[model samples]
Target: APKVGRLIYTAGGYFRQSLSYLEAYNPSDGTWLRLADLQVPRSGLAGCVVGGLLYAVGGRNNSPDGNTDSSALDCYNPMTNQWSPCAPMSVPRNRIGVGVIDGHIYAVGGSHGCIHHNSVERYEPERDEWHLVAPMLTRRIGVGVAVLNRLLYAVGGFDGTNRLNSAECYYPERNEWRMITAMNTIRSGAGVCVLHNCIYAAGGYDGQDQLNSVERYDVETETWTFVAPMKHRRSALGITVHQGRIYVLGGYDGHTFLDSVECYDPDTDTWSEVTRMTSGRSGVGVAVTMEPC
Candidate 1:
């Protein structure tokens, strides 16, 4: 067996306040190990791994300089356990959604200040630069994204006026976004991932209240159906898949920052407590990568 085939990581969140904290979860023992700190503290960021490198995308922060937007992209290397700066986005994107496809990272809708954005951008590591892509059909902030069947799906989020139940998928081949069947309910700050060839969107704010409910989408049927709800109502959480299970990390309950971690098993349609983080975090960025131990 591989000694360290996969490890899940969480970075940059609000723990009392915006943080540069980075940590990794070892599934072998169900424990977390702290890693190097980010150069900049941020929250509402999105994370994805490409070619074994974890990229922390756009987010917001409280800087003494007065600029709240963290437009600069940061890359983490487990081999070195350090972070380095990369090309920044054209605009600061807080609560952005990110997806990795065709070896490129896509930065989706997010806002800077109270203004929401429908714009999107793509990054090319080789060129060390970012380029604007075809924008999403609707403006969105706090959107959830997942890549399935080589398509990038942008799910429910607040579109400035209301929390959205709508969803759309991007076709990179043609550089277009097409509307898909909507989810069962509106969701923002939800945790989204892919497992067993299906996309799952978990707990988030539904405008009226924080949610513990979950939904699953089947690509073949292009339909979303309800699933088991979580034990805790959460939003602004970090989510990723590992070893056939979905893992949801720290989130907010509208009242408190949560340090609780939950795991869902599709086979049983049940959720169970996995482990807690070192501290509470909301608007965290999460990713899974394989490395040699």
Candidate 2:
């Protein structure tokens, strides 16, 4: 029985040996259902749904010494209720951002070993190969990436030295990147989403403190404007759009992990609390797949 209804899914965080899991929430009834668990126990991974198939990309597996990076790519087929391995990424990375444009998945800048990176790669499912693209002008980790109007936007991230307020737009057709208007505030580990022709950047660390600020970018004007901030300050929050509203999920507040979920109404320019996630987490990825109700 395919649920065949609007549903929200979230991933569990792994800080040790435990394998991370996925849970589904039914907004209508306010109840959650645990789905399949990930084949790998990882953190700092990114997830995206394309053509109803969900993919979890590169992340790090926690190690006793510190952390170990992974290039493993896993695919989950809801139709079969199964998880399977896919083509791995070329470089082992964690804390990266993922986006899809024209059926191609792009894994952007992330931390590699002791250094942050600016390299970008695209995955073609048909050929199961990754092709390198123009690297970003600034090397960064914990970045937020979104595709708007066929152009890719890489927003605020940590550049190793400090949190960055800078952003850039990638024109795939031109095979080049151009610096865009900078964000009003500098932050890292934020979540980014695209809705109603506007790209929203929310939550993250601002160096000195965690942040709940939300900013929106206009593609036409190449500018940014402040939006209603989240109810709580958090970093590495997972964000997505469902049923015409933006949802912010699990993240950390420097001192502790969070399980709260908040939704933003663009029409009202306000935010409201929703059902909390099953577990508190940060650096998790989110995705949604359902036929319009």
Candidate 3:
């Protein structure tokens, strides 16, 4: 029998094109397998895992220069192999940051062509409703978001006018966004995840350059410190942690779209380039779950 691990990448893009696709990687065998097609094709999207279901949310249905942004929210159950619809967002967006906090899904800043936004929205599963939440302090696109210590952190991203080193965290209890320490480098399209109580930010573009630089946020000290740069420069990537290690996948280097995979070991403080995906992808949605029986 083939080894099975449960981390999913949903809708994504190949250059300016979108995919109604899904795929997963199995660490046991170190291979990727195509899964289910999304009911809608999208790019520049974000996803979160909550209650064992993957929530695929707002993104673009069009192009980089300009096009349509999507408000569609779809949910997938890897174990059941099923998909379902939920309420749409008030505003359509792409390259957003998404996170699950205290049983609700939060969608953070992304662009809508004319303006990069600072808005945010939340979805409640029980009510099946979308509600506006406190917006981020900065308007940004391709931002990295994660939940740590019950707080949702929105990291470096690109505002329409500038790439930002700025970051902020949302406290659900207070229903507000408070400014936090900025990253060491300005970036957008970075992939971020929470591992071992620390928030990690990886490769993305910093205005003129696609970046390989990485950093970790120590909540206790409220500081951003550099980590080892990735083997390749990447932007528009998706990341998550599994079994104590961080995995990053699919992004655009300055020269090419990537299907390359890499993981960082916290214990040894190193990075290992792993297997590549069958197709090059960028601006992909990612989520993680334990291997299903």
Clashing pairs in 3: none
lDDT of 3: 0.83
lDDT of candidate 2 at residue 284, scale 0 to 100: 85
Which stretches of model 3 miss by more than 4 angstroms?
A: 1-5, 8-10, 63-66, 290-293
Could you give candidate 1's per-residue lDDT for residues 1-293 as a string of tens digits? 23356888999998766889989898878877888999989999999998889999998885556649778799999899889899999899999999998789999999998889999999998789999999999999999999987899999999889999899999999999999999998999999898888889999998878899999999899899998999999999999998889999989998888999999999999999989998888999999986424
| C-alpha TM-score for every candidate | 0.96, 0.94, 0.94
lDDT of 2 at 121: 92
- TM-score for candidate 1, please give it: 0.96
Using lDDT as the measure, what is the rank order of every candidate, best first?
1, 3, 2
Residue 169 local lDDT, model 2: 85
Tens-digit lDDT string for candidate 2 (1-293): 23557567665465333237877677778888777888877778888877777788887877565667878778777777677888888898788888899989999898878878899999988788888999999987999988887888899898888899999989998989899999988979888889888888998888888898999998888789999999999888888888778998888897778888899999998989988987787778787765222
Instruction: Report the poorest 10 consecutive residues by lDDT, candidate 3.
Output: 1-10
Tell me the spans in candidate 2 whose CA falls farther than 4 Å from its real position.
1-4, 15-19, 64-66, 291-293
Candidate 1: stretches off by over 4 Å: 1-3, 63-67, 291-293
- lDDT per residue, candidate 3, 1-293, as tens digits? 12245654545554657777778787768767777788877889997877878888988876445567888899887777667988999888889899988889998888886878899999999899999998889898888999987899999898888888899999998999999988888888999899886889999888888888889999999988888778989999878787788888889998888988899998888999877877788888888764443
